Amino acid sequence: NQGTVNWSVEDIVKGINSNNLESQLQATQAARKLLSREKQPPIDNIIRAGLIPKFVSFLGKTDCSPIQFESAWALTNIASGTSEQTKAVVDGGAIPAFISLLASPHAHISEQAVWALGNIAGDGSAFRDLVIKHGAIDPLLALLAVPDLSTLACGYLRNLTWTLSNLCRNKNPAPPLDAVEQILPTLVRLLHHNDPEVLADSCWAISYLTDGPNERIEMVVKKGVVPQLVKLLGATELPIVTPALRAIGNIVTGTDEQTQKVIDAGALAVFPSLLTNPKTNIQKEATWTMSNITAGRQDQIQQVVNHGLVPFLVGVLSKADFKTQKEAAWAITNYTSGGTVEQIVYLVHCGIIEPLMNLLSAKDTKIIQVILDAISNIFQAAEKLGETEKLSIMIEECGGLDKIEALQRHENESVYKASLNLIEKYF
C-alpha cells in the first residue's frame, strides 16, 4: 500500500474528517506509518491535531477490520511514548475499546489490542489498575486457555506474555491480590514454555510479583515455581538468567522457610558460576542474593559452606566491580552475625581477612561500617576460643591495623567509635 508513505499531519487530518470510511482508512494508515517511523515520530503533533478520539472510534468498526488494525497500531505507538502521551490515549477511552478487541476474530487485530494494553498498563500503577478494573484479565487469559501453548503464533504469545508481565508490574501499590491470583496459573504455564522470549518475560513477571512483602512472595512460592526458576537460573541466555536471578533474590528476602525452598530446589549449585559470571550486574545480584541467604539460619549457612561458596565470596570480596564488593561485605557481615564459631572460623581459614581489610581503603562510609561490624563479629568468635591475639596478628600481617587506626580519625561517628573500640579492645 504505497499511497500512504510520508503524509503531512494536515493531510492525515483532511482524510480522517471526510465522511468516507476508506479515505479515513488511508489517512489512518498514513498516520500509523508516521508513528511507525524510526526517528522522532511526530507523536505530539498527532495528539495536537485531535486525532485520538477518531482513532479510538475506529477501534469499534467491526465491519472494517483494516481500520481497526491501523488505528490500533497508531494508538499503540502513541501509548508507547511518555506518560503524557499514554494518558492522551487513555483519555480518548481507548481502554474499553481495546479490551473489546481482544475477542476479535482477526488474530493480528487481537494481538494489537494486547500490545496496546501492554503499553498502557506499563506506564504505572494507576493505569495498570485501570486496565484491570475495565476487565482486561478474563479476555487476556482466555486467549491463552489452550491445551498446548505451542499451537499459538510465536509473536502473539510473546506479546501476551509481555503484556501480562506489565499487569504484574510496579509496586506502589502492588497489583490487586485477586488479579495476581487470577494471572498466576497461566503465568506458571508460560514459565514452562520452550520459547526463550516467553521465559524471559515470565521470569520478569515472577520477579515483579515477588518484589514485595512476604505474603506476595508466598502466593508465588505456593504455586511451585521455585524449582523451575532454579532451572532457568542455569540457562545460557542472559535475558533469561537476569530475571530468574532477580526472582530468586527477591524470594530469599522473605522468610527463612521461603529461602529454604530455593536451597531445596538446587539453587546454590549454580552460584559458583553466577558469582564468577562475566556480566557485572549478574555477579552483583548473585552476591546480593547470597547476602540474604547468609542472613538466614545456621543450617542454611551450612548449606552455603557445603556448596563451596565461601571461597567464591572471598573471591568476590578480593576482586569485583565495587558495587558487588559492597554486597560481598554485607554477605560476610550477615554470615558473621548469625553463624556458629566453627562457621566463622572456616570463613577466616578461607582467607577472608586480608581482602576484607583491603576494602577499608574504600571512600564509601557505609561499607566501612559493614566491614568493621564483621571484624567485631569475627573477634567475638575468636574471643570464645582464646585466639583473639592470633587474629590481631593476622590483621597486622596484611596491614589491616594500619587502616583501622586511620579510621579512628574518620569523619563519620559510627565509624570512628567502632574503630576506637577495636584498637583498644584487641590491640
Binding site: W115, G155, W204
Partner: peptide, 15 residues
C-alpha cells in the same frame, strides 16, 4: 525469529 523484550515498560511497533 529473535526479539527479546528485555524488561521494557513500553514497546513501539516498528514498520
Amino acid at each position: 525469529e529473535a526479539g527479546m523484550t528485555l524488561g521494557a515498560r513500553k514497546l513501539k511497533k516498528l514498520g
